[PDB]
Design a protein around this ligand. Structure first.
Ligand code: 6Q8
Ligand code: 6Q8
Ligand code: 6Q8
Ligand code: 6Q8
Ligand code: IMP
Ligand code: IMP
Ligand code: IMP
Ligand code: IMP
Lengths: 332, 332, 332, 332
């Protein structure tokens, strides 16, 4: 083996990230303004805009979830607060019209009760929110939830980074599979644990397991530009979950911060020291203030529509069949 | 597939850009001063110098087009102004002697009338100027133009980045094919839409479709150094179109700008916010002031001549048969 | 041969370093808190924590060796001082309870007497400490030591970077093989001599020679983050030796340094000008002050435990069978 | 072809430079102090130290040539001055004992007379000094010189970057072949002409043509560290020619320069604007002042000796058979 040892499977793959690829233009009859951006969040739920906001306490509380749903996407409420408070945020969203909402639960002691309270509150999507869903504890939770409330509530499981892990969630009964181990902007899983999978390759691998079972893949983490959304969907994801890109918006939690004459908002990992208040796997930082969510979403969707125009994709389903070119370091 | 999924065509190619390759020296009897730099702009039109200026409102108006033609190249007049004004710039050039001139048209409402006015004004080359020529609307325009004024006017179509798109323009009747989706210095197509193709690979692919039909390829965008011109032509292009490299010249539109004791001129994408005055696919910036066009062209052609000396190329046609070595990140 | 010449063996391999790979998550029933971090330092000696401190005069004297052993690892005492002083540091450690300790010897004039004095002082591990163990002088020393004190003292040999060199040390009778030629943070072997081997590939190659003989590999040098420890062990090493990561600790030798309002400690190669007081193969620098060793070790082991959780590794032996994904420049 | 077009020979090779490779350690009985550093400069001339100074007017005049010869290497006198002055510098060196000296000539009008005057002055080596020796004008000069003064004077030809060019010089009768098109520190051939060849691959290719005919290769340009000398010789070169590494020495021409409290000397390409006093293919810069040549050479040779120790090379001939590992961007 050219890279060492005698085992060709030791280094199993070459992992590509968003900056490693570009979408190739293709024959097109599609104007960007006329493209159809709708896509499956889960087997049953279709969104007008294939974007969901991260279950983080500096991204999504009731305000964000309401704005996201009104923009045609959805918010996933974070779970870093008492169960009664999360359920109360679910209610607040549902009382603002017939708006879709999801909410994160863990696999811990009180996870099952949290889930039951959220259902009672009228939640549409339950997200089993973990760093590593390839764990019998996570797969059991996913299964237990689907068998209990599956008729009324869609159950998302995550996160995974390999084909085998996505396959296990599919078998456990997941209505969607969330992909991303290591790629988050505030993530230090890669440096702390040495663990991860570049996101384009992880999406391609997860989609190979999920698509044949009609299970949508949510691409979660590592998205920096609107063009990365197009790339994630062309790799086969059906939606993208955004943290950093939305953390600087008016609707996110947290106050405005002024440093050196410029405006910021705090953005922090759920595995950072201050969020857990131990070995942190996230940092605390700031992102530029971006103004209203509606503006940000408009530019993101605008970029998506441009990609759909370039690739001749009339629908997201068509975009998922687009081709890439791999680029070198010099490209960029 | 080592990079993910089971489809080997999903990532179709490894795209190389100018910084990824060097020209290999070869046996030579050619002195740089004696090389023949002439080359086909289109099937019918040969230039003394294989360089054309970009159809941008910070690069080419009448003054640039006159200087470019006198230097042995050609200018393509931008179309960001009323039809009567563009036609008046065409006249202004033709009244400055028997100088070649081209002019951009789009595919929009008034594109056909613009084209007719330009012809009446005496234009030599019509450039169907789009970000994505692989669109039936663009191919139709190219065809409609060639069938109407083809005897008197050469019709360029662009831009493309793939072999199939170049082939479609050839069949539509293009007299030259312009290559470049994503590589412009002021371009944000890559980050906004996630779409593009590294320019050496795009030229190689387009030339594979065009050369067998005797259709010249214009390499458009991404050229930073005189050595990049040599590389573009050795990849098989017949001419290079330059924006950034000429935007800092006395003959370009726009005034001199002083910042921190240094001289600049504004240079902006035609898809930037201020040029369109929406989801911009270009930025606005500045380039260093370079002095007279004649000086810049002299150094560019000087570099080209040096490359022709190193590669034993007596003509541009010979240079198109030169070989590359691929380099690594460390090289550079 | 695509890279030049006609000999495919001239460039024998593509060497990967820690930043070139990530650990892939795998099916897991392992909680980080419950993972077993114990591992073989040598054939006979198992540590509770697979970490040893570098035999450097800015890393390990008696204080460090005591702290390291109490934390479940071990220190290797540096040999840059009189033999009687090194032996006195060995005694000092052994008088602080039943704590494991090792000590470096060279291959020079007084190396054999140093070794004998260390044994008399009660040392547990002798480390034949060289930059290049593939030297008959080093192999002879290793052999001579093992045949003389082998029943009572474990003999480590190093350093190596190739499979053949590790194999030679195994045959010489080494109880562990230390891997790393070129990767140290303060190392200039690579720039001064042009010699080295990227550490993941060197570990994989050394383990291919050592593992079939039940000889543990110590990964020495180049480790920057806790995640690198996980990667080194997954490549097949049984322990990691740390210099830079521990040089900033309270227990390391040297005083606190204040520069620009921040706290540092000096950290220098044993082959630097000031350590040898000639052609230096190390530099002198500073690392940030890190506080007590116990804190640093806790975070390092925490990262290791996280990796074991992600990879489903209940033991270090299991972690050694984990898989990597190779990443590109863009990843990082 | 994965990188574009249908011609696999269009991109002929992947070119590696010094930073792309490391020397692999090997079994060794060689102490650095005992290695034999002597090597062939030409078929007939062996140097004690395999280093020659560049024929540049900021590197080698009489003073440098004398110091270089006394250190066991040789200087090549630059040709940027009247013929009588160059010949007078040759005399000055020969009058300082039985010291070897070489001198550059071109292929121009007065090149032949320059060569004759140098011979009369007692020169030992004539270097036909060009940027591209694969030119019948250069090959003719090499041949004409060898057939005229070949019994008394060794004739070097250069520069080349390909196997075929080296082969042509061998057939022309060169006593040594100098390799390097594009790699010089002050070189802009790569950016101006887009032409070049990464130096490790160029050396490997040139040696494939020269070694079977017993013709030594001089590696010229791109050497930044003493470790690069070892790498150049292990690729198969017999000597290295140094510009930047020696330009900062007391013995080089030019005065001391003080900027921001630090000491420098000017270092400039022979193809820079100021050296030619047009399309320059070199820049003018400064390098740090390094003190006496003897110190610099000592450290360079020290690094070489270290490499010989690591690779088990008792002679330069043995070092030429050493193996490399290719490294990634992350390595470094
Ligand atoms: C550090 C951490 N561990 C867990 C976790 O769930 N651990 C766990 C997993 C399986 C299990 F059975 C029992 C516990 C979580 C949520 C976190 S987090 O707060 O930092 N959030 C994320 C989310 C997504 C990520 C992708 N890469 N890294 C990520 C971190
Ligand atoms: C953003 C944009 N879209 C179009 C465009 O023509 N859209 C379109 C295409 C086909 C069609 F049928 C209908 C409309 C244009 C001209 C532009 S531009 O002003 O920014 N100019 C260019 C030019 C070259 C480029 C290469 N990569 N990106 C480029 C942008
Ligand atoms: C520069 C140097 N040479 C030797 C050395 O032992 N030389 C030698 C080797 C075999 C022999 F038979 C006779 C002498 C040592 C210890 C050193 S050091 O002080 O700088 N330490 C290390 C340690 C680890 C390294 C990995 N890469 N580089 C390293 C340097
Ligand atoms: C720019 C230039 N051209 C020539 C030259 O000889 N031209 C030429 C060649 C063949 C011929 F028949 C007639 C003329 C030279 C010397 C130079 S230089 O002054 O700049 N020196 C070098 C030396 C080494 C180089 C490697 N890459 N680039 C280099 C430049
Ligand atoms: O603390 C953390 N460490 C690692 N990943 C996190 C952490 N907190 C949230 N994440 C994940 O990172 C995603 C956001 O990534 P981003 O959009 O690149 O900022 C989230 O949706 C989570 O999957
Ligand atoms: O706004 C824009 N976005 C992307 N490409 C543009 C834009 N405006 C002009 N271009 C293209 O970029 C070329 C100039 O590229 P440059 O020479 O690298 O500066 C032009 O000839 C166009 O093809
Ligand atoms: O001077 C030196 N030059 C090269 N390597 C050294 C030197 N001194 C110590 N080392 C090695 O570098 C290791 C520490 O590397 P680090 O943990 O990356 O700082 C040590 O354990 C030695 O193997
Ligand atoms: O002006 C120039 N342009 C390109 N190469 C040059 C020039 N002048 C000298 N050289 C070459 O660069 C070598 C020195 O390279 P360096 O050691 O990397 O600085 C010289 O020996 C020449 O071969």
């Amino acid at each position: 083996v050219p890279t060492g040892g005698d085992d060709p499977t030791k280094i199993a793959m070459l992992g590509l990230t968003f900056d490693d690829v570009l979408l190739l233009p293709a024959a097109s009859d599609v104007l960007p303004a006329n493209a159809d951006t709708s896509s499956q969040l889960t087997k049953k739920i279709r969104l007008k805009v294939p974007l969901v906001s991260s279950a983080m306490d500096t991204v999504t509380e009731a305000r964000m979830a309401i704005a996201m749903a009104r923009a045609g996407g959805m918010g996933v409420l974070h779970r870093n607060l008492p169960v009664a408070e999360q359920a109360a945020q679910v209610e607040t969203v549902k009382r603002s019209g017939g708006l879709l909402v999801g909410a994160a639960v863990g696999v811990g002691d009180d996870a099952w009760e949290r889930a039951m309270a959220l259902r009672d509150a009228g939640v549409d999507v339950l997200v089993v929110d973990t760093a590593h869903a390839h764990n019998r504890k996570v797969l059991d939770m996913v299964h237990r939830l689907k068998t209990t409330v599956g008729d009324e509530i869609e159950v998302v499981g995550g996160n995974v980074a390999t084909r085998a892990a996505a396959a296990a969630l599919v078998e456990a009964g997941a209505d969607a599979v969330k992909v991303g181990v290591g790629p988050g902007s505030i993530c230090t899983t890669r440096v702390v644990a040495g663990v991860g999978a570049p996101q384009i390759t992880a999406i391609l691998e997860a989609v190979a397991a999920c698509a044949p079972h009609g299970v949508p893949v949510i691409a979660d983490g590592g998205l920096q530009y609107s063009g990365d959304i197009a790339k994630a969907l062309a790799a086969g994801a059906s939606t993208a979950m955004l943290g950093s890109l939305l953390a600087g918006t008016a609707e996110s939690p947290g106050e405005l911060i002024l440093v050196n004459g410029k405006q910021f908002k705090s953005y922090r990992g759920m595995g950072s020291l201050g969020a857990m208040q131990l070995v942190p796997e996230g940092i605390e930082g700031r992102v530029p203030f971006r103004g209203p969510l509606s503006t940000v979403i408009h530019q993101l969707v605008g970029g998506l529509r441009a990609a759909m125009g370039y690739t001749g994709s009339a629908t997201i389903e068509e975009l998922q069949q687009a081709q890439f070119v791999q680029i070198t370091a010099a490209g960029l």
